[PDB]
Design an enzyme around this catalytic site. Structure first.
Site, short mmCIF file in Angstrom:
data_model
loop_
_atom_site.label_atom_id
_atom_site.label_comp_id
_atom_site.label_asym_id
_atom_site.label_seq_id
_atom_site.Cartn_x
_atom_site.Cartn_y
_atom_site.Cartn_z
N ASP B 116 0.80 -1.22 0.00
CA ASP B 116 0.00 0.00 0.00
C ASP B 116 0.84 1.28 0.00
OD1 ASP B 116 0.44 0.68 2.89
OD2 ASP B 116 -0.75 -1.14 3.23
N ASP B 117 2.17 1.18 -0.01
CA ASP B 117 3.05 2.36 -0.08
C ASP B 117 4.10 2.23 -1.17
OD1 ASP B 117 1.89 3.95 1.84
OD2 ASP B 117 3.19 3.18 3.48
N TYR B 155 -5.57 -0.06 -3.91
CA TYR B 155 -6.33 -0.93 -3.03
C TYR B 155 -7.72 -0.38 -2.70
CZ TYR B 155 -4.82 2.36 0.69
OH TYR B 155 -4.61 3.48 1.47
#
Lengths: 420, 422
Positions: B116-117, B155
């Site tokens: 997610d990063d 996401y």
């Protein structure tokens, strides 16, 4: 003997025994000498003050009182009966002796009775005033415990603003100074609960009415009264001229244990000095930096990171110079959204300053001391999110937050009435 | 085989092993079955994801992974390499295999790779090709475990580029991620107010499988003053047949997630938010001590949900909006009658704070204390202000008279910056 050290006297989650032992190490390392135990919501200290400690709590208090002796910190045990004590009922008095006796068999020798909040009909018959009821029981617990070396008494009028009609002419303080035994000491927070300054002439004024030099309970670094505030600035607003006029100074600092390095380091510097708040903060920050390691790796934080962070969470009546600077500069940018080259050049410099907030948060989340990072996390995350939004906004000019609490506060007209 | 339970996936202080065992106990008590371990600031989970656990950290993970089995909660270990991994370099891949190998020898059988990063432009044609290559190779290297999860970089709906149906990234993921690996999804947003059924069918088409929801409905790590005690809400029970699971990412304060996990448990009946909250509040009341049921009703309504206040909370605010809007009048008996009744309701906030600070369950009280004290003090000020507004037929004094304590002006430097944003 002048008392100087820490009172754990705030509201909310109290500190844990390991945090307090570590407090005793730094008090000793920096030549302070006192710890006053008074966590407002440790249930057996105030809400359920009559309940004696269990077998397991007895073992933890004995161990903690032994550590204070090991590190040569005087341990003062406080209790706050004021919320529902019936002063004229013998069993309430016996219960208060029974419960201090039990702490006394844990190794403790110094005590305090606190009356920081808000009289029943049965005690109106026996006692002439509220000051007489507290002084009677305080004097009797005092003598009953053998007149201990240190016994402290926090009055209900414990600051200038809480004095009725005023400090010098208060019925309440006048009874206390006249009838409270000379060997018991009086706690005093200054002109206010959170005093910006504690002027010598105010201490003189209270010392006449209470007939003795007070012990300062100092709330300068307390942060339990607002969820978003943290105070990493130097001890300040109290002249070293107070020292010959005081029986001691005990700070009640931030709830987050690791955030009180500066608050206690600078108080220690001030107790030994004569005193420069800015020089004290530079010694405290320089020493603090050593605790922000990098994790050892088998497969960061700078001094200027901590200067910026302290300036953004400084003192209850003042921001640090870098905080006031970024806030003055963003006011100017917003207000003025040739002169075009100035605005863009200063907008460019201001986005760079916002970047330094983001970078300080990033390296702080890489440090090896997870305890320090967790204690300050929500404060550092919050200031970073906002500056990232402020930075976006300054760029835009060039191209539910707070919950229900926040929505009520924006509807009050004094919402930003103390902004710059 | 539907996974439903808790992801510990927020920022800040992680939970301690004693809280986690107690979570497994409640997951079991309420018939949930899954725990995903992903605290963003366990330094070895993400920032230093390559570093093995020490002898003492290893012993703590083994004990905790064992407690999950005792309570028959499936334990999923996540890792986030995405901030500094070189996907095309073999030594980096081995570093991540050795690191999952070590958790695997602690008893752990289910895993997740979260994203997610460099030199990876040479070997991989896109970022989705880089992650799926290393995800698939990690997957098979551990023997294709029962549960393997993959959190994509896009996401949620708003994070998809240009949109869900047309994203190069998700479609590469849906084509090239092996069928045995599952894909995490937060809905249309990071914190989704609703997760509409047609959004899940749309995303399921491009990723070519039913998602597992990573639900941020009750997360409060993104705003200091926020806590979420309202019911699980905004997801139709119709999603249960089109989801591979739901894992809620709840409040950072462990004891504040009684309602958040209880109501998700009630909803897992393949549902009325209001009825679910009355079951959770009645049960929760028993863990205190005194606090009454209507106290917790008031408390939940003041800290409800990211896009909604509870009915008692929303009521006190429109009513104080009206009182403030029509104070000029101080026919007129309307304003005073409603000011008295609104002053009465502020008392219920104050009384709810008082009994909560006298309750025997100190653990719960410390987790929420900062939140309860903050709402009580504001309403005390809001009540004072309403009193001031009606007391002006006979007084010209201002609201704040003279010099104030710092808590009269709220927020510190952060607050002064926020007031400068429109």
């Amino acid at each position: 003997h002048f008392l100087c050290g820490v009172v754990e006297g705030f509201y909310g989650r109290p500190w844990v025994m390991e945090q307090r032992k570590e407090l005793f190490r730094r008090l000793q390392k920096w030549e302070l000498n006192t710890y006053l135990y008074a966590p407002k919501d440790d249930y057996k200290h105030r809400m359920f003050w009559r309940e004696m400690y269990s077998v397991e709590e007895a073992e933890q208090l004995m161990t903690l009182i032994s550590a204070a002796r090991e590190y040569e910190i005087e341990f003062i045990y406080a209790i706050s009966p004021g919320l529902d004590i019936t002063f004229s009922n013998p069993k309430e008095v016996s219960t208060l002796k029974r419960k201090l006796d039990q702490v006394s068999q844990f190794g403790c020798r110094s005590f305090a009775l606190l009356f920081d909040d808000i009289m029943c009909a049965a005690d109106k018959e026996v006692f002439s005033s509220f000051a007489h009821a507290q002084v009677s029981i305080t004097n009797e617990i005092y003598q009953y415990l053998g007149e201990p070396e240190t016994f402290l008494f926090c009055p209900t009028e414990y600051c200038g603003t809480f004095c009725y009609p005023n400090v010098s002419q208060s019925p309440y303080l006048r009874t206390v100074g006249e009838k409270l035994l000379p060997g018991i000491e009086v706690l005093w927070t200054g002109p206010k609960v959170v005093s910006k300054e504690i002027p010598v002439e105010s201490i003189e004024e209270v010392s006449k009415i209470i007939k003795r030099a007070p012990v300062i309970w100092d709330n300068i670094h307390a942060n339990d009264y607002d969820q978003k505030r943290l105070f990493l600035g130097p001890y300040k607003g109290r002249s070293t001229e107070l020292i010959p006029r005081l029986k001691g100074v005990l700070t009640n600092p931030n709830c987050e244990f690791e955030a009180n390095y500066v608050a206690i380091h600078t108080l220690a510097t001030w107790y030994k000095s004569l005193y420069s708040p800015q020089m004290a903060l530079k010694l405290a920050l320089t020493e603090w930096l050593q605790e922000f390691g990098v994790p050892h790796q088998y497969s960061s934080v700078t001094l200027e990171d901590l200067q910026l962070l302290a300036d953004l969470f400084y003192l209850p009546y003042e921001h640090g110079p870098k905080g006031a600077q970024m806030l003055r500069e963003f006011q100017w940018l917003r207000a003025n959204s040739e002169k075009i080259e100035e605005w863009r050049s200063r907008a460019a410099k201001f986005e760079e300053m916002c970047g330094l907030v983001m970078g300080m948060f990033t390296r702080l989340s890489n440090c090896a001391n997870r305890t320090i990072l967790y204690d300050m996390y929500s404060y550092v995350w919050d200031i970073k999110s906002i500056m990232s939004m402020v930075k976006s906004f300054v760029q835009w000019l060039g191209c539910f937050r707070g919950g229900l609490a926040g929505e009520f506060q924006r509807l009050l007209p004094i919402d930003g009435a103390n902004d710059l």
